[PDB]
Paper text:
[name] [name] up to three distinct [name] enzymes: NanA, NanB, [name] [name]. [name] is an unusual [name] in [name] its primary reaction product is 2-deoxy-2,3-didehydro-N-acetylneuraminic acid (Neu5Ac2en, also known as DANA), a nonspecific hydrolytic [name] [name]. [name] adopts [name] same overall topology as seen in NanA [name] NanB, with a CBM (residues 85–271), followed by a catalytic domain (residues 272–740). [name] catalytic domain adopts [name] canonical glycoside hydrolase family 33 [name], six-bladed β-propeller fold shared by viral, bacterial, [name] mammalian sialidases.
A covalent complex with 3-fluoro-β-N-acetylneuraminic acid is also presented, suggesting a common [name] with other sialidases up to [name] final step of product formation. [name] crystals soaked with 2,3-difluoro-N-acetylneuraminic acid (2,3F-[name]) presented continuous electron density from [name] ligand C2 position to Tyr-695. 3F-β-[name] was covalently bound to Tyr-695 in an unstrained 2C5 chair conformation. [name] covalent bond distance is 1.9 Å. 2,3F-[name] was also found bound in [name] CBM binding site. Equivalent complexes have also been observed in [name] C. perfringens [name] NanI, [name] Trypanosoma rangeli [name] TrSA, [name] [name] Trypanosoma cruzi trans-[name] TcTS. Tyr-695 was confirmed as [name] nucleophile by soaking a [name] crystal with 2,3F-[name], capturing a sialyl-enzyme intermediate with 3F-β-[name] covalently bound to Tyr-695. [name] electronegative fluorine atoms at positions C2 [name] C3 allow trapping of [name] covalent intermediate by respectively providing a good leaving group [name] destabilizing [name] formation of [name] positive charged transition state required for enzyme desialylation.
Numbering used by the authors: 83 to 741
């Protein structure tokens, strides 16, 4: 399969290039594939990589193009004036703009297939959308096509949608190339910045909530939400997936599922993106969500995550019950047997299920992975699969038998429908992990657990206290251990309003820590402790970030090397009142009085490109690793997109910009 036209190194500044003689009437069947390796010199405006049109007066709605917007959206149009058919197919956040002050080379493609009546778009190895349209047009369907151009669309004798940049290579084919070919053709250096990808070894099409941490031995470790039924928080199925690098982030292991339930199979699902359809959710599998990592002094690694029973929504679930009882001064996880109204059972020593009415052991037990046994034998339930037949969502028992689990909707004994926190530990730096441990009811018996602030925890240097950031919706909850993580306590700090106070900590000097957090007022807040987290100041606010009221998670870390002779912190956050966009990395230098001089910043891409949750780590070579949601993860227009959580790196010199 060879192109009808191939051109190289065409640099343009808005004016385009006529290629009518080299394309006229070459699209014999009418189908097409166009593969464009380009970089933009300017992102501003609506720009067409190529345009095939009727250029005559009155025929300005007769064209085909592939376009780029200043927010990284890749799209195509196919329109015919006389039939009044107007097709637009696109996906937000498909391309990259700039990286470290240089234009990024992307490779994109469009495929139009008349037999299928589909338009497909590809960006950097990913098929970002394929859509079947009733009013499909191929090139032969559009009347009086007379003008074929690079970097523009000729409409009524004028160049519209002028491209600014270089078309490094452009190929036009007069047929619909197959998906695997086009994926391969669009694969490039950008593709290699995805650690997690759609339908990799996680089975998930979607990801959110990345976390990076560098261990004491030099291994760089990542965790992330693998979200199977679109990118919805709830209801969904979510697992925590992990991947690591032992060469300073150059190469990563194939992702593994590290915290996962198996009530629902971890399968690749094509979640709909249309208005209305995109609100679809599954009925809900048991869920792990929002991971937090810390390495202990002794090199053991902890990972925490929120746990939600299957079908339980974070909005509706009960705030007035911890899911525990206190009996003889011990905290036991309580259970309700199917058919009962009361919670008459507790999981006690060795996982034995007791009847609290009689205070005697039953035939039932629960193992350390929440699985239920009767007389020493596992009870089972049948796993669910989700599918699209057609195009309706179906959930069904799929023939796989899995252990019955107290978090499942089909369990004979069930936990309270509320949120919990679990942690697991590793003694080999992330290669293998213990069974989970649910946090005891540190908020009290009559309150739900807190929600974790995704990112890392810290070890405060003077006391060795371990601190894990969390929040309740009205308070900060700083979870801590003073015995190297054997037992856990909490400091609960009331907040000025109902902030989703996802926080991260830094240590300014021994005993002095600051908690940086999301608010509901548009600003980033920070609270200060001068006694290793025992007491906290009133909030203060960064002066230079102005976001929407809903806010976004942030990442802030200590950096080990001096910058301008000073101890430094590094912050990552969006900064825009218009959405989750305009990602910035800020360098803060610690002054002698423990205030911070926010001296430098670097915009991660152009300001209208998407930037939501993020995570920073210092690499062992003292470069900075960043993984982030390169899209607006709040927007209802950017839900359920594949391959949008990249990893990139910076040298400090890349970041020391602007002042
Ligand atoms: C890709 C896109 O958004 N194309 C639309 C057309 O589908 C149509 F809506 C039109 F009106 C037009 O020019 O024909 O406007 C443009 C465009 O919004 C504008 O030119 C603003 O640059
Ligand atoms: C972030 C998000 O806003 O994008 O929100 C968290 C909470 O929903 C937050 O309270 C909303 O303000 C999500 N976590 C949970 C537990 O819902 C994050 O995963 C993320 F979705």
């Amino acid at each position: 399969e060879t192109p009808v036209l191939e051109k190289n190194n065409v640099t343009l500044t808005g004016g385009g290039e006529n290629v009518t003689k080299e394309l006229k009437d070459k699209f014999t069947s009418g189908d097409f594939t166009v593969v464009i390796k380009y970089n933009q010199s300017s992102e501003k405006g609506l720009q067409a990589l190529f345009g095939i049109s009727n250029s005559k007066p009155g025929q300005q709605n007769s064209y085909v193009d592939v376009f780029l917007r200043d927010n990284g959206e890749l799209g195509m149009e196919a329109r015919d004036t006389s039939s009044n058919k107007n097709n637009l197919v696109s996906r937000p956040a498909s391309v990259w703009g700039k990286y470290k002050q240089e234009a990024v080379t992307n490779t994109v493609a469009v495929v139009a297939d008349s037999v299928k009546k589909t338009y497909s778009l590809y960006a950097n190895g990913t098929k970002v959308v394929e859509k079947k349209v009733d009013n499909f047009l191929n090139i032969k369907d559009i009347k009086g096509i007379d003008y074929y151009m690079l970097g523009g669309v000729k409409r009524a004798g004028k160049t519209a949608f002028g491209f600014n940049g270089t078309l490094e290579n452009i190929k036009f084919f007069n047929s619909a190339l197959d998906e695997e070919t086009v994926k391969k053709m669009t694969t490039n250096a950008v593709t290699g910045h995805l650690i997690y990808t759609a339908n990799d070894t996680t089975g998930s099409n979607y990801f959110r909530i990345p976390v990076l941490y560098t261990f004491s031995n030099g291994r760089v470790f990542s965790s992330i939400d693998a979200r199977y039924g679109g990118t919805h928080d709830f209801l969904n199925k979510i697992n925590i997936a992990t991947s690591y690098s032992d060469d300073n982030g150059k190469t990563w292991t194939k992702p593994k599922l590290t915290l996962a339930f198996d009530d629902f199979a971890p399968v690749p699902l094509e979640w709909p993106r249309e208005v209305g359809g995109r609100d679809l959710q599954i009925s809900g599998g048991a869920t792990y969500i929002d991971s937090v990592i810390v390495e202990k002094k002794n090199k053991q690694v902890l990972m925490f995550a929120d746990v939600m029973p299957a079908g339980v929504s974070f909005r509706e679930a009960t705030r007035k019950d911890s899911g525990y009882k206190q009996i003889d001064g011990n905290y036991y996880l309580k259970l309700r047997k199917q058919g009962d109204t009361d919670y008459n059972y507790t999981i006690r020593e060795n996982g034995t299920v007791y009847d609290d009415r009689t205070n005697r052991p039953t035939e039932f037990s629960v193992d350390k992975n929440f699985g239920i046994k009767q007389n020493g034998n596992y009870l089972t339930v049948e796993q669910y699969s989700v599918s699209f037949e057609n195009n309706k969502k179906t959930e069904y028992r799929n023939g796989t038998k899995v252990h019955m689990n107290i978090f499942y909707k089909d369990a004979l004994f069930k936990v309270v429908p509320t949120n919990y926190i679990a942690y697991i530990s590793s003694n080999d730096h992330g290669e293998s992990w213990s069974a989970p441990t649910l946090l005891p009811p540190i908020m009290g018996l009559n309150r739900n657990a807190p929600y974790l602030g995704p990112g890392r925890g810290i070890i405060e240097s003077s006391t060795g206290r371990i601190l894990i950031p969390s929040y309740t919706g009205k308070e900060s909850a700083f979870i801590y251990s003073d015995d190297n993580g054997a037992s856990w306590k909490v400091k609960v700090v009331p907040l000025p309003s109902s902030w989703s106070a996802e926080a991260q900590f830094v240590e300014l000097s021994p005993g002095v820590i600051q908690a940086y957090m999301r608010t509901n007022n548009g600003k980033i807040a920070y609270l200060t402790s001068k006694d290793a987290g025992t007491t906290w100041s009133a909030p203060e606010y960064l002066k230079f970030v102005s976001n929407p009221s809903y806010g976004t998670q942030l990442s802030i870390i200590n950096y080990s090397q001096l910058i301008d002779g000073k101890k430094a912190v590094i912050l990552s956050t969006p900064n825009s009142t218009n959405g989750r966009k305009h990602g910035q990395i800020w360098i803060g230098l610690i002054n002698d009085d423990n205030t911070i001089d926010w001296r430098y910043h670097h915009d991660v891409d152009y300001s209208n490109y998407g930037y939501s949750y993020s995570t920073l780590t210092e690499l062992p070579n003292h470069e900075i690793g960043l993984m982030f949601e390169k899209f607006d993860s709040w927007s209802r227009n950017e839900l359920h997109m594949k391959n949008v959580v990249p990893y990139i790196t910076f040298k400090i010199e890349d970041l020391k910009k602007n002042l």
